[PDB]
Symmetry: C3
Subunit: 348 residues, 3 copies
């Protein structure tokens, strides 16, 4: 017998004051379209120019927000002439061979001088070619290493603009429920005298007069409130000798000695009769349970970043460049000939 037969002090309205309410309801959201350049980048021209390659995403966000003795002296004469004549013929061999040698040395040394001037003109081409191609690699790699950090910050400002767009769509879907509230609250109270307490102005309703506002309706409700209420002990029902008895359109207001079915909203007692009450059987309480569970979504739970990264990274290190190490490739006769050019006159 838990609570259905407990008696507790309940306030029941004892007189009235006449009153009026001004109640303001908004009935209509202006389309807060966003320029996506000025939001994300603003004045800063390098990121602005990057925004064009993010495509027409800005428009896409605005679709959302815009909606919503003579013999031996003579034989010595034969002898010395035969020694001389044979010597000079050996001088001509000695000298002709030296000319044929020194003329092959002067050939090959000038062919070497030609080869080195060929090498210098070709290597001037290589250090000139590498000057231009490697200056361009340097100048363009400096541009590309300036440009992946600005995209990083644009992409984190994209999320700030997507939080802007979400909170601006969220509010517009509350506004469209407040326009449904303005529809039911217009209908039931401008087209319809209510018997509900505090709907259509504080207290109890007499009459109303709507007036417009720029995006709203305002109601003048004429109503009466309780100027003066008393706590009567009560029960919702009473179980006499195993039968439960309970009101019809009232409560059991409790007098010191008797039960009366007062109207819930006023102290005006009337006697228990089979026309003021209903009746039951066996004196039992039915117990009901209601639990208004408002949706808890499937939130997007993820692996640790190491697992979702390692699924698809290559730690490729290019080798230390080694190339060819070219450091590993490593007068007396003219004095005499000048001396004997003089000292041969001592044998003239």
């Amino acid at each position: 017998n838990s609570v259905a037969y407990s008696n507790n002090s309940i306030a029941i309205p004892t007189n009235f004051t006449i009153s009026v309410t001004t109640e303001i309801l908004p009935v209509s959201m202006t389309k807060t379209s966003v320029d996506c350049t000025m939001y994300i980048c603003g004045d800063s021209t390098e990121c602005s120019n990057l925004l064009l390659q993010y495509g027409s995403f800005c428009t896409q966000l605005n679709r959302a927000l815009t909606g919503i003795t003579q013999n031996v002296l003579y034989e010595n004469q034969k002898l010395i002439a035969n020694q001389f004549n044979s010597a000079i013929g050996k001088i001509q061999d000695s000298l002709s061979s030296t000319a044929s040698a020194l003329g092959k040395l002067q050939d090959v040394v000038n062919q070497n001088a030609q080869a080195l001037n060929t090498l210098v003109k070709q290597l001037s081409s290589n250090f000139g070619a590498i000057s231009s191609v490697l200056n361009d690699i340097l100048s363009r790699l400096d541009k590309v290493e300036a440009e992946v950090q600005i995209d990083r910050l644009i992409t984190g400002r994209l999320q700030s603009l997507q939080t802007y767009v979400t909170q601006q769509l969220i509010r517009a879907a509350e506004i469209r429920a407040s326009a449904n509230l303005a529809a039911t609250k217009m209908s039931e109270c401008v087209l319809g005298q209510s018997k509900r307490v505090d709907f259509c102005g504080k207290g109890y309703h007499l009459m109303s007069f709507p007036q417009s506002a720029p995006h709203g309706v305002v109601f003048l409700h004429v109503t009466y409130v309780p100027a003066q209420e008393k706590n009567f002990t009560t029960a919702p029902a009473i179980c006499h000798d195993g039968k439960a008895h309970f009101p019809r359109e009232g409560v059991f207001v409790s007098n010191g000695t008797h039960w009366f079915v007062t109207q819930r909203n006023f102290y005006e007692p009337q006697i228990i009769t089979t026309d003021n009450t209903f009746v039951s059987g066996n004196c039992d309480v039915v117990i009901g349970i209601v639990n208004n569970t408002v949706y808890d979504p499937l939130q997007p739970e993820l692996d640790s970043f190491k697992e979702e990264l390692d699924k698809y990274f290559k730690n490729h290190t290019s080798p230390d460049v080694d190339l060819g190490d070219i450091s590993g490739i490593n007068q007396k006769e003219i004095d005499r000939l000048n001396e004997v050019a003089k000292n041969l006159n001592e044998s003239l």
Copy 2:
């Protein structure tokens, strides 16, 4: 005494026509799961292959959407022989030294020819090595400079798909409120005869019959509407000699000469009595104010992009490459020897 005692013409229902309403309510959203490749990239294979490195984000979005004288002639003979014998010994010195010199020149010139063929084989290695390593740097840098612009456009299409997912979750959270409206509107009108005007069909309610639809309920409401209404002047209350008097379940319909408490929803006058009215004291109006402020969120306001960028940029420019400038490193005797090889026979 603002509005509670003003009298204005109010329409009060004068006859009825019987009527029926067909009212359609949707009570149930099909799970619009999205393939994230086909949405963002479509057929285009280079961006498709990039999508795999964005991780399983697609699934994460689908968790959401799937939820929700003889002596001097002889001394001259001694003399000339002594001059000749001494001269030839000086010829052998002159010639042996020239051979030892010209044999050191032919040694060193062929050691130079060896060194230059060593240099050409090592430099053929360097321009062949740099050919391959620098072609790869060129060929791969062209690939990497093709691949940061396609990620830009994928990342702006991600926001278009996140606006898709947000508007598809927003609608599903309206659908779940329309399924709560279908619960109260089923209960109060299929299980319960309403005393409300225009709830359960135009006019006043008699009876109803629900019928299903594929994702909805449809009600046949049987109701009566006012076929024919008259404007009576009225007041919500009247203050006689400093006491306010007001109805009980009606309005003061105003006849040319008397006040009657008509029922709000019909013209049927009844006389003012203490059983048709309540009464007050001192003739004052209570004024109430209600302002139904619907949530305005903390929207994500940001610095200018220059401040949020400059927090974390280095304008490093690599110097213009300069390297070594190798352009800054800059027969008559054989004719005679051929001539005296002939002209020495003139002294044979």
Copy 3:
């Protein structure tokens, strides 16, 4: 005459059991603020350090979530001496010219040896310079080609965190409607005895007692339910000789032989009278239609990726590097002089 005059079996309440309901309503959401590092990257330090360059986007998401014979022998003596004296003067020319030649060969060969040691010291500089500058280009390009795949996965985890933030704002905008439901459901039932069936506990309302819970209100409703109901055939209205007749606060309960206006919620018949019914004219049914179309947004439809890419791509291929092709730049007299240095003694 479609449905307004059809008669069908309707259940009308025949006794009561007293009952109590416990009804639980949540009235208040704890601020689930998110550390954005631990959500997206977690422990993994390389992506963590990247998060700083995405800016204070994390804060921006937390603004949202924290809200919400002697002569001829002598003439031969003159002759041979004149031949010898003239020959030696031609030897001095032959030898002085050879010295002046061989001294220009020994000059130019050592000037060549100087030029090649100059070349090797300058080229040691070039292969040393290119060693350092090209090792840095290799070492830094390896760093930059490691650093665009981790940003890809951060940017797809950003969308997972933006789905988290959207579903956490969506739920908080349902919570703020459930706090409006707790306001009306507190007011009409703690401050006000309802005449509605199943609002304020199963059945019909007597009385109630609210009790708090940590984020909720719980109502004890005392109510009566129907312990025991009978199907009477009925019509909502009847059209006698071309006039439609219909109840006032009841239904036409159908007895075997007569029509009675029973109260909708109880079987208790009363006779048709002009005080139990309203009356009409011409016997016609008005037909009304109501179609409660719940917002279907402008969803962000996009071109194919090829069109939105091609608006802003350059397929620049750098040419195959060609450079200078240096492979296209391509003892007997000392034996004799050693032989005649010996064989000239045969003419001493």
